[PDB]
C-alpha cells in the first residue's frame, strides 16, 4: 500500500486541478494564479459541517471522505511533511474555523472536528461586524506572512453570518540555480489576442528536466522543471511549440495524473531557458466552478444541509472564494493563497 499522505495528496490536488479548470475556462484571456491544495483544505473541513445530499456531493466531487479510516491522520502527516525543515524551502499551511458562539452546535461536533483536523477554532460574535472581520482578516495576514492583507472586503460578512472556514497557504522557495540578474533583458510577449509587449524576461543556460508532450489533437507542448534548492519542490513550465495553438487546449486535459506523467518522462537536457518574470494577484469566486463539479446544494437555500454543525436554523454557503498572489523573479518564487468559505454572508 502506497504511502498514505501521498495518496490523500493526489486526491486533494486532483480535485484542485479540476477546480482550476473551471476557473480557467471562465477566465480564458485573463491571468489566473490558483491554489489546487487551498480549495481542497476548506472543502475537507466543510465535509464535517454538512450532511445529507449536500455532504455526499462534496465527497463525490473530491473523491474521498474525511471520515473514513486513516483518512484524517494522513491529511495531518501531509501538513507535516510539507512544512518540514528538510525541504529547505519554506511552506506554511493553516486552517481555521470561525463559528457564532450562540450557535447551538449539534452534539459531538466540536470535539470530533478537533480530533480529526486539530486546527484553530475561534468563537466570535458576528453581531459585532467590524471586529469580526478584524479577527479573521488579521488571522489570514499573519499566517500568509503579510501577503493578502485584506481577504474579506467590507460587508463580505455580517450579523447574519454564522460559519467561516478559511485556509492560509504560504510558500517561499529559492531556485536551485537562480537566474543571473545580468541576463534579464526586455523581450516580446505575444498576447492571446495577437498583440505583443516588451516584458523583462529572465534567461538561463543549464540542463533542465525536459519532455515533449503531444495533445490528442496532435499539438506539441513543452514541459520543463525548475526545482528549488530543497530538491523536493519545483515549478513546472508548460507552453506550446506553435503560437497558433492556445493554452486552452493544454489546460482542458489537465489532471494531477498528467502532471505525474510529465515528471516521470523527463530527462535533464541542456537548454537556454528564457522566462518572463512576473507578479500576479488574483481573486476568484469559487461558486460557479464548484457547482460545475456537482456541489450545487451547498449554495441553494432550503436545499443546503448543514445539520452536522447546527440545526437551530437552516444554513448555506453565501459565498466561496480564493485570493492568491505570486512573485516570480531571478532568485525564486514566493506565492501565497488564502481560500475561504462563508456561510450566511454575501
Amino acid at each position: 500500500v502506497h504511502h498514505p499522505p501521498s495518496y490523500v495528496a493526489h486526491l486533494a490536488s486532483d480535485f484542485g486541478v479540476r477546480v482550476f479548470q473551471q476557473v480557467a475556462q471562465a477566465s480564458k484571456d485573463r491571468n489566473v494564479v490558483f491554489s489546487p491544495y487551498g480549495v481542497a483544505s476548506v472543502l475537507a473541513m466543510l465535509q464535517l459541517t454538512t450532511g445529507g445530499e449536500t455532504q455526499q456531493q462534496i465527497q463525490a466531487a473530491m473523491g474521498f471522505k474525511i471520515d473514513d479510516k486513516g483518512m484524517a491522520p494522513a491529511l495531518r502527516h501531509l501538513y507535516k511533511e510539507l512544512m518540514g525543515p528538510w525541504n529547505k524551502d519554506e511552506i506554511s499551511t493553516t486552517d481555521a474555523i470561525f463559528v457564532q458562539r450562540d450557535l447551538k452546535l449539534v452534539q459531538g461536533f466540536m470535539p470530533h472536528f478537533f480530533r480529526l483536523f486539530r486546527s484553530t477554532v475561534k468563537q466570535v460574535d458576528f453581531s459585532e461586524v467590524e471586529r469580526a472581520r478584524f479577527i479573521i482578516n488579521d488571522w489570514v495576514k499573519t499566517h500568509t506572512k503579510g501577503m493578502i492583507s485584506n481577504l474579506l472586503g467590507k460587508g463580505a460578512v455580517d450579523q447574519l453570518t454564522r460559519l467561516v472556514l478559511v485556509n492560509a497557504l504560504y510558500f517561499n522557495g529559492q531556485w536551485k540555480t537562480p537566474f543571473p540578474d545580468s541576463s534579464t533583458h526586455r523581450r516580446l510577449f505575444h498576447k492571446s489576442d495577437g498583440s505583443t509587449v516588451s516584458v523583462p524576461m529572465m534567461a538561463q543556460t543549464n540542463k533542465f528536466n525536459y519532455t515533449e508532450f503531444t495533445t490528442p489533437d496532435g499539438h506539441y507542448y513543452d514541459i520543463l522543471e525548475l526545482p528549488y534548492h530543497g530538491d523536493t519542490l519545483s515549478m513546472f513550465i508548460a507552453a506550446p511549440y506553435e503560437k497558433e495553438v492556445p493554452l486552452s487546449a493544454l489546460t482542458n486535459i489537465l489532471s494531477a495524473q498528467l502532471i505525474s506523467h510529465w515528471k516521470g518522462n523527463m530527462t535533464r537536457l541542456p537548454r537556454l531557458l528564457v522566462l518572463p518574470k512576473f507578479s500576479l494577484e488574483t481573486e476568484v469566486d469559487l461558486r460557479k466552478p464548484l457547482e460545475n463539479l456537482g456541489m450545487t446544494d451547498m449554495f441553494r437555500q432550503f436545499q443546503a444541509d448543514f445539520t452536522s454543525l447546527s440545526d437551530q436554523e437552516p444554513l448555506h454557503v453565501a459565498q466561496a472564494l480564493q485570493k492568491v498572489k505570486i512573485e516570480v523573479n531571478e532568485s525564486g518564487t514566493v506565492p501565497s493563497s488564502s481560500t475561504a468559505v462563508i456561510v450566511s454572508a454575501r
Binding site: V33, F171, K191, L250, I259, R271, P335
Partner: protein
C-alpha cells in the same frame, strides 16, 4: 555554439508542486505579464 533555446514568449502554464507527495500547491495561467 548554443543549445535549443526555449522561450516563454506566449501565454504559458505553471505548476508548483511538492514532488515526493505529489501535492500541487499552486497553479497558474500567465496570459500577460
Amino acid at each position: 555554439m548554443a543549445p535549443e533555446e526555449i522561450i516563454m514568449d506566449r501565454p504559458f502554464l505553471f505548476v508548483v508542486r511538492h514532488n515526493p507527495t505529489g501535492t500541487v500547491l499552486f497553479m497558474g495561467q500567465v496570459m500577460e505579464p
